[PDB]
């Protein structure tokens, strides 16, 4: 600290023990990331095998009832619970664990511990980048998945009626969440979601293109027919011919990369930007502020009985979702709908 | 009956950034 005496205290001993090379590094974030993450994965795994969801959702989402990996899920609490943190010691469970389960408390446990585990994992990336003395572009990239986690598992149920409308920790419940936004929100039509789709598809495109181009322009670097044995970290020369790659993609696609930095920063930028745009769109849907309908098209459809497009068809299929799916997805709302008022056309 | 609000919104969001980037590109090309 600037050639000072720096008298050693318990802090320096603890820092010296935490910043050590082991099989798995601990650091300061190990005070948070390790317990929070281990509790999150253990809570999800325990809820997916034993903790039932019969009380809250009126369904089975655990292995102990007859569900598979693609069926079991740590389910959210009931909508009447609102937005309670739902502690095991709170007014809900009153200190009782065996009924803290089957009431959605384990969902809140997993969600809070996962959020703090993600916080600790970015702190992990930051402090390890400090130890290796490298820029934390990994943390810069990781800022987007946690933005998605917050906007999806926290902001959306916080803005809507309660945790019941949040995604439950599972597979088929996530699929229900997806179809829920499809029918109730028309999330495909939201421009921010279109940006998120473009970002992920472009990121996978960059992944495949970069890997294929580097692996097909990787020089000889030896005599053996296996290219992987020709790589050596001791030499400082570049493994692949960037000028050859640039010429190839310039003559195929028309545009090509000239800078490794700009290439890798693009690979960094596209998924982060797409995921932040999707996070902003889900923040918009957290307040039920939808890109659901087009005013000109709905007016033209109302005043023209023979003008129809795929948007009108999509609206109708959304009504199919709502009418035939909310009746069972929302047991708290008590939809005892007769099945002659549901929209159901010819034969099917 | 022509949605002039959306028209001027689209026109401005095209015109202002493309002109601004053209100014920056012209000063980059003129002053090497």
């Amino acid at each position: 600290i600037g050639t000072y005496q720096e008298k050693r205290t318990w802090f320096d001993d603890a820092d010296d023990w935490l910043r050590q090379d082991r099989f798995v590094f601990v650091g300061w974030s190990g005070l948070l990331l390790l317990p929070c993450a281990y509790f999150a994965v253990g809570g999800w795994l325990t809820g997916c095998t034993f903790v039932t969801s019969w009380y809250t959702h009126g369904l089975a989402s655990s292995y102990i009832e007859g569900c598979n990996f693609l069926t079991a899920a740590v389910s959210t609490p009931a909508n009447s619970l609102g937005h309670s943190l739902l502690f095991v010691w709170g007014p809900e469970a009153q200190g009782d664990l065996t009924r803290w389960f089957q009431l959605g408390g384990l969902w809140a446990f997993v969600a809070l511990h996962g959020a703090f585990g993600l916080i600790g994992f970015m702190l992990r990336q930051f402090e390890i980048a400090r130890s290796v003395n490298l820029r934390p572009y990994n943390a810069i990239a990781f800022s987007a998945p946690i933005a998605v986690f917050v906007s999806v598992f926290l902001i959306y149920p916080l803005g809507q009626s309660g945790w019941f409308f949040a995604p439950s920790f599972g597979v088929a419940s996530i699929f229900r969440f997806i179809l829920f936004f499809q029918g109730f929100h028309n999330w495909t039509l939201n421009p921010f979601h279109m940006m998120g789709v473009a970002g992920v598809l472009g990121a996978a495109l960059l992944c495949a293109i970069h890997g294929a181009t580097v692996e097909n322009t990787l020089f000889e670097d030896g005599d053996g027919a296996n290219t992987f044995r020709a790589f050596n970290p001791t030499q400082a020369e570049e493994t692949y011919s960037m000028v050859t790659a640039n010429r190839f993609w310039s003559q195929i696609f028309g545009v090509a990369f000239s800078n490794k930095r700009w290439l890798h920063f693009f690979m960094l930028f596209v998924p982060v930007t797409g995921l932040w745009m999707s996070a902003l769109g889900v923040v918009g849907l957290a307040l039920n502020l939808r890109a659901y309908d087009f005013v000109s098209q709905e007016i033209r459809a109302a005043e023209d009985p023979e003008f129809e497009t795929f948007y009108t068809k999509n609206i109708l299929l959304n009504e199919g979702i709502r009418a035939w799916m909310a009746a069972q997805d929302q047991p708290h709302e008590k939809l005892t709908l007769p099945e002659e008022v549901l929209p159901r056309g010819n034969a099917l | 009956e022509v949605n002039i609000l959306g028209l001027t919104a689209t026109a401005l969001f095209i015109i202002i950034p493309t002109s601004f980037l053209l100014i920056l590109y012209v000063k980059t090309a003129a002053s090497e």
Binding site: M242, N246, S250, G254, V255, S258, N259 | L7, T10, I14
Partner: peptide
């Protein structure tokens, strides 16, 4: 003018990508 403005935007995108393919800066430094 409903379809014409989307026509302008689409033609602008096509012109920009055409100019980016052909009237691009030459690739320097390798």
């Amino acid at each position: 003018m409903e379809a014409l403005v989307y026509t302008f935007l689409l033609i602008g995108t096509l012109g920009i990508i055409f100019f980016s393919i052909f009237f691009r800066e030459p690739p320097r430094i390798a």
